[PDB]
Amino acid sequence: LTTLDVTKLTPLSHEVISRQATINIGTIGHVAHGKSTVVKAISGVHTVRFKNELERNITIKLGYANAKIYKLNFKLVRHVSFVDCPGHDILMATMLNGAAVMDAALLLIAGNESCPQPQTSEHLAAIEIHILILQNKIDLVKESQAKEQYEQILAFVQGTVAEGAPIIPLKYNIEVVCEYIVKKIPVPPRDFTSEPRLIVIRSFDVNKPGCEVDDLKGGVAGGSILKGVLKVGQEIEVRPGIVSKDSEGKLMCKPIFSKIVSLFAEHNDLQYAAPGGLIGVGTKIDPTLCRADRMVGQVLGAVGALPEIFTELEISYFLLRRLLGVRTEGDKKAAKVQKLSKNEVLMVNIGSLSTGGRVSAVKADLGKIVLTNPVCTEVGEKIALSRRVEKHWRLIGWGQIRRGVTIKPT
Amino acid sequence: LSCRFYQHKFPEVEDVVMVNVRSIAEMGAYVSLLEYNNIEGMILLSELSRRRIRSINKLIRIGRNECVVVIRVDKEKGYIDLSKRRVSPEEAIKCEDKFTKSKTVYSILRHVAEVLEYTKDEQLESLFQRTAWVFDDKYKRPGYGAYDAFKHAVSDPSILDSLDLNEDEREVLINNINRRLTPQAVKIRADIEVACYGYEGIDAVKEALRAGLNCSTENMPIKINLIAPPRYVMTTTTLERTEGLSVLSQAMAVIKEKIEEKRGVFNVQMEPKVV
């Protein structure tokens, strides 16, 4: 059983006290829903099944996969989480907006061909930044395997300018790769002493239909802790809160304060919480206020974090000319990032929080975009800008937050 | 098989009585007195209505029951004459209630006779003379007395046991009365969305729900279920729907007061209603 407690002063990244989730690792590759088999064989099939509802944005939500690497009746050396979502553009936008995203990179590249998909994956990995490639072409000819290894070595030599120094080759090879990763997994610096800060990526309410008179447990939001350490029983605050425009004028965004009743991981998480995982905080919030995925796009703070609610923000427009790492064979203006036209709707993804906005005005220096919903992230965070080419939102450029119009409702 | 509901044979004058029309003649309309073992009766054409009426068929409607007063009785010749002009709507209402209660009593007695398999009509007449008409004579109020006694027997079986018919016959009568004079079934449902998007949201919601449910007395347990996230259904399966509606209204008022006190949200999705 777990050996957790409620006694800790300076948390350690490699401490065995928690043994639940230490570092969030990403798995980026062109597997195209083929990395699921590798992830399952690494950790488990359905180890995380505690709350499911009608999926809201399956293709625009990152999914974690905890994995406790145990070796030596054995001992767990480390317990990390694997993150892999469909669409490398969203992951790259999330990564290039600060830090604490895919601390360890695993590339489950195919060892059969060297098509443009591996090149795009390598370009995305380079733009996001330690990476570890892998050859998934099992059950093939030994000479063909050697030829594919030589081709992958050539590609790695080409990519060594940015990141091209990996080494890899029915789960024996998978176990060897896991052991090598555990050996080479650098410890990342995470601040456990700062004020609590989390981003909610999935809101839930486990109260099934026809509940009891008083047995009404509600307010179990889910997300990832950005900075600090969260303890059960603390008074958490929702930075976004309830935003209502019924005042026949400027919208009023009143935050919500609730005592953190419990904190649960895929397993039974301790009272204290460690950053780098998709943990859920259940508080004294009304289930109506947080319906199925209703409270998404919110920031949970302890003492009212510095992130202030904003309505319109001025960004420093800076986009890429062509498509980063992507170039169609026809190239019939498809892989050509057009100029930032006015009245164009696009999302800015700060960390894991993605908000929508239209470019009301911009002249070569700073676009004043009025956000879709009020947001509270930071005052100078590097905000990315992504636009949908065709049914797939992709990064268009970067910018910096300078000023804007803020609101503070009580 | 069938007999007169009351021991009395010829109804007195100025007594509103149920009839069933059968045919039309020149002198008037032929009827059967349904509750007096279907004795023949007459309604004079000159008494059908206060207005000027030329055709008897304008209001006869052979095969349709009616409420007619009795204007003249002649026991010697077996002639009874009835009327429709004299009867008031209130008199018709009370006579209809009398007829319904007498029909219920006769259904109970006929079921008892069928259970006893009394193929003799004399046995059934004696059953009427002994079982039900005893309370009619005791109460000195025909019609209502039998139904009131049967209701009391369904409540307290002392009245049924006091009859001197038999032992097995008494058990059959008690079973028939229970199956017939005890049709209690009610379930009052209501919907209200009680939720407080404040500091102690779930806590305040649970406290308000408990306070509201505390008003549910015995034999009326108000059970609250979470049909939806923000809405809750309160169900009270109890008899006396007239009092049940008041109880549900009081509980709703208490819940609304509790929700408003803690600065929350309370909406009345639907008023209490039967299921």
Side-chain angles (χ1 to χ4, degrees), chain A residues 11 21 26 29 32 34 41 44 56 63-65 67 86-87 93 98-100 104-105 110-111 116 118 125-126 146 155 159 162 164-166 169 186 188-190 192 196-197 204 209-210 218-219 221-223 228 233 240-241 249 255 257 265 273-277 280 282 287 292 294 297 301-302 304-305 307 310 325 330 334-335 347 351 356-357 361 364 367 374 380 384 387-388 392-394 397-399 404 409, chain B residues 1-8 10-11 16-21 23-25 28-47 50-54 61 63-65 72-74 78-80 82-89 92 94 98-99 101 103 106 109 113 124 127-128 130 132-133 135 139 142-147 149-150 153 157 183 185 190 195 198-199 201 204 208 211-212 221 228-230 232 244 251 253 264 272:
Chain A
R56 203 139 186 178
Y64 290 83
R190 288 170 180 85
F192 321 97
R197 254 199 164 189
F204 292 104
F257 314 97
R294 170 154 272 268
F310 265 122
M347 71 204 67
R387 191 196 293 187
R388 180 191 301 191
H392 280 86
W393 293 88
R394 285 211 170 186
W398 338 267
Chain B
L1 173 58
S2 291
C3 304
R4 49 188 204 273
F5 294 155
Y6 314 147
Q7 70 276 17
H8 187 13
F10 273 32
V16 56
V17 66
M18 295 298 102
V19 297
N20 174 277
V21 288
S23 66
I24 295 172
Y30 286 100
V31 291
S32 315
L33 277 296
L34 183 63
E35 65 272 32
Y36 290 83
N37 207 351
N38 298 292
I39 50 156
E40 194 174 6
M42 294 299 291
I43 295 89
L44 274 72
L45 171 153
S46 69
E47 214 66 28
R50 174 185 187 181
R51 315 285 87 184
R52 294 319 97 74
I53 301 299
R54 298 285 75 78
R61 187 48 200 280
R64 195 186 81 251
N65 302 0
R72 182 191 64 92
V73 65
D74 276 331
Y79 273 25
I80 192 66
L82 283 81
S83 171
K84 193 47 167 178
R85 179 163 58 104
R86 328 275 187 80
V87 288
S88 292
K94 44 199 79 163
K98 288 215 179 154
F99 174 78
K101 289 187 225 190
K103 283 308 298 292
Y106 177 85
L109 274 296
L124 182 143
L127 180 61
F128 291 168
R130 296 170 312 179
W133 291 348
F135 321 113
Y139 256 158
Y144 297 132
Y147 198 76
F150 285 3
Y199 169 77
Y232 304 101

